[PDB]
RNA sequence: AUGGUGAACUAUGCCUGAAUAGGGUGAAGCCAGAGGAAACUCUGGUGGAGGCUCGUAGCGGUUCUGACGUGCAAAUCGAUC
RNA sequence: UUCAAAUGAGAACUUUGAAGACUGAAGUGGGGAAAGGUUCCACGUCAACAGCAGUUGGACGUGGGUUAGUCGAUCCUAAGA
RNA sequence: AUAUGGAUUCUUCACGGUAACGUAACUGAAUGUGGAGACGUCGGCGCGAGCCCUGGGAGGAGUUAUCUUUUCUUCUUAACAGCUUAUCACCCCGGAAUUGGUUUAUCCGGAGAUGGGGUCUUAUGGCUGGAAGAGGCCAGCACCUUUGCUGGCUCCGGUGCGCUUGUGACGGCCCGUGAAAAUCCACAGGAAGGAAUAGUUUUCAUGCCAGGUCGUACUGAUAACCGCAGCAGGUCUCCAAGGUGAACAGCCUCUAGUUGAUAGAAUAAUGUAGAUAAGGGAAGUCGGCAAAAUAGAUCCGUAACUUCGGGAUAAGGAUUGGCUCUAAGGGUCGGGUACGAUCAACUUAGAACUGGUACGGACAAGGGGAAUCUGACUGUCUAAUUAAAACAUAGCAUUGCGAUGGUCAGAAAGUGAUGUUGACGCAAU
């Protein structure tokens, strides 16, 4: 009914090399997460908290990891970080960014 | 390829003088969404059939490990 | 055919043994005239009719 | 070189058709030595024989 | 003329198998309704019959008297059927 | 059909990659029956054959390969002999 | 071959249920009876399986100037075993008209309906064992390396005139009524053998040993078969994705497989194949041969004649896109002994608006009418020049024959076909 799921993104690795901005990544998610098909309709249903090494999303509305991958891959292409960063899931809802 | 429910018959069957090997298998199952448990299967190799006794209680399962005769070749995996 | 009688496969083994050229040293024999194998058979040229 | 046998085994090893198997052109010499299925399995693991991406048939216009 | 060999093609019988979209039409049987001097007649459903029909696969082979006609082929190829 | 690389004395035709296409599931796909008989696979190899070519091949030389109480036959009978 | 456990007996060879019947077994010789083996085709209807479609979630890949909670892809569960699961069928109670029950399809009930309660077939389905340890999809860490190792996830649903296939209960059809045996089981019958300090059952369970011989590779066909060949021919069969669409049509795509047929340069005549033409519209020609036109679907309308079934899609008209809407057509849960909620199919009809009057927009797809000759029709034949007015056919009619027979076969026979036949037949026209 009102159960909340927590999605964590480990952005620790690419932030030291200077090619990634963790603060902007949380900002990007806020504006573009669609909740019943609307941007900005995140009326406390979802919440993106960023602390410099990990970005967490807590949602009671519809949300899935395959959506979060879609938005993250949207951002890296937008900023030309593709073929340099991969969105990878280490385990369930424990996604991580790989630089290699 | 058979199931037996009573622990009494397993201890009788494991000394059937045609039994040479038996296996202990560990399975992580989910009864309720609140908590997982450990489900262990005790199998015994008979000349014509494989009897699998399924035990769900972890405490009762441990009591059955040392209950087997020492002459039995027990496989744990 | 795949399923076959023992007569057929036995007679094919005979025809498989016989399928290779002349031994080389035979033409080195004294008073030899056989220059090659005139009974060589291939599966694409002539059929065994067995 | 002649790598038809190597491509034939790779299709059977990876479980796809020959039209999908990709043989590395710059690593031709190594592939020519892969005469068994065990060798092809070694070459698939280390990226010398990548399987492929599948050709898509989208149902977005049908939906 | 004598003696043999052929039904691996083809003809017919018998035995045992196997194959044959999607449409049109809408027979008996059945249900309800309507008009009714009765008698009886009419209407709408249902149903899914026929060596029926349009038309695939299949089986065939009408016309172009088309292609080819020292061919792909000692009978094939395309269209139409 | 095209571009490039590899091999070779030699590449329109072999291999690999890339691109462009086709068969379009009653297929140019995957299995069999009859028939064939080793055509299967590897290695070497191009005098002859693949009506151009050839380094390639169902070619040539040399070898390897078919594992059943349960799949068949083996048993019954049919029309028949 | 064989022992133990189990089962049974002093009421010698089992009990329980009113019953249909049940169980772990639960003596049964000769002989006899019954069943399975064991059977057509079509039509529609119910159920199952695989596939197809689709939602959430956990992974991977693609696009990302813009948009896309997005496109593609993995999420599987065998033979065998236990428990349960069934339309049909049957048993007990009870006694029916104000007849009722009921199928898509109209059959059943005083020879026992409706109803209430039970028994059974286990096709099939579900759960569990097999079995996640397998397979699938990913992540991380080393390496000449024979190479690896370690982790996770592999979950939960929905829908249907869908496709293919299996199965069930029915119906239609027949002057057609749609094999045989080996083998397997059951029943009736009472031979014989048996119990007490002890007997009996190997249709219960478990335990032991063996299973010979020949085949097995490959192609199965515009290159492995047959056609003088690596031949545009011929050759029996199984599985069958998405879209458009009535459609295993035609066209495009996915899986899989090919990219094979001597090439290069120019674009003369004449060819083969494909096409278009002003005005006329068969004047061409033996002859409209060839080509053109018509063509899907919805609505309207449809003559002569007729064996009343047809003719008929007769002839002849209109419409057809896109977009925004409107209306109708269902399931399951909710009441002291009218309606509301939720969920899910494409089906039809109607209305505005919109466009270079277009819209079965490619593909796909009847030209029609009035007559005469002839064959009634469907069907069959001259493989390779004739598909027809020929042959067949039903129907009609005739002829022979009652078995020491008719018709016919055979060198002959203690020989045969019809004949497993019998005039409602067989034979010949
Ligand atoms: Mg009156």
List the helices and strands and how they pair.
The structure is cut from a larger assembly and holds chains A (100 residues), B (77 residues), C (50 residues) and D (63 residues).
Chain A: E1 5-10, H1 12-16, H2 22-32, E2 46-50, E3 54-59, H3 65-78, E4 86-89, E5 95-98
Antiparallel strand pairs in A: 1-3, 2-3, 4-5
Chain B: E1 2-3, H1 7-13, E2 21-32, E3 35-45, E4 50-55, H2 58-67, E5 73-76
Parallel strand pairs in B: 1-4, 2-5
Antiparallel strand pairs in B: 2-3, 3-4
Chain C: H1 6-17
Chain D binds 3 RNA strands through residues 1-5, 7, 16-20, 22-26, 28-29, 31-32, 35, 42, 45, 53-63.
GO molecular function, one term (chain A): structural constituent of ribosome
GO cellular component, one term (chain A): cytosolic large ribosomal subunit
Keywords (chain A): Cytoplasm, Ribonucleoprotein, Ribosomal protein
What overall form of chain A do the CA principal axes indicate? globular
Spatial strand order of the main sheet of chain B: 1-4-3-2-5
- What quaternary form is this? part of a larger assembly
Overall structural class of chain A, as computed from helix and strand content, comes to: alpha+beta
Number of helices of chain A: 3
Largest sheet of chain A: 3 strands, antiparallel
Helix share of residues of chain A? Answer: 25-40%
Question: In summary, what is this structure?
Answer:
This is part of a larger assembly, with chains A (100 residues), B (77 residues), C (50 residues) and D (63 residues). By secondary structure, chain B is an alpha/beta fold. Helices cover 22% and strands 45% of the residues of chain B.
Can you tell me about this structure?
The structure is cut from a larger assembly and holds chains A (100 residues), B (77 residues), C (50 residues) and D (63 residues). In chain A, strand 4 and strand 5 (95-98) form a beta hairpin. The termini of chain A are far apart. Chain A has helices at residues 12-16, 22-32, 65-78; strands at 5-10, 46-50, 54-59, 86-89, 95-98. Chain A is an alpha+beta fold and 100 residues long. In chain A, strands 1-3-2 form a three-stranded antiparallel beta sheet, with helices on one face. Chain A has a two-stranded antiparallel ribbon with strand order 4-5. The longest helix of chain A is centred in the C-terminal third of the chain and has 14 residues, at 65-78. Chain A is built from three helices and five strands. Helices cover 30% and strands 25% of the residues of chain A. Chain B has 77 residues and is an alpha/beta fold. The two termini of chain B are 19 Å apart. Chain D is mainly alpha-helical and 63 residues long. Chain D has helices spanning 4-14, 28-32, 37-45, and strands at residues 22-23, 49-50. The chains hardly touch. Chain D binds three RNA strands through helix 1, strand 1 and helix 2. Chain D: GO terms for molecular function: RNA binding; structural constituent of ribosome. Chain D: There is a cross-link at residues 20, 52, 59 (Glycyl lysine isopeptide (Lys-Gly) (interchain with G-Cter in ubiquitin)).
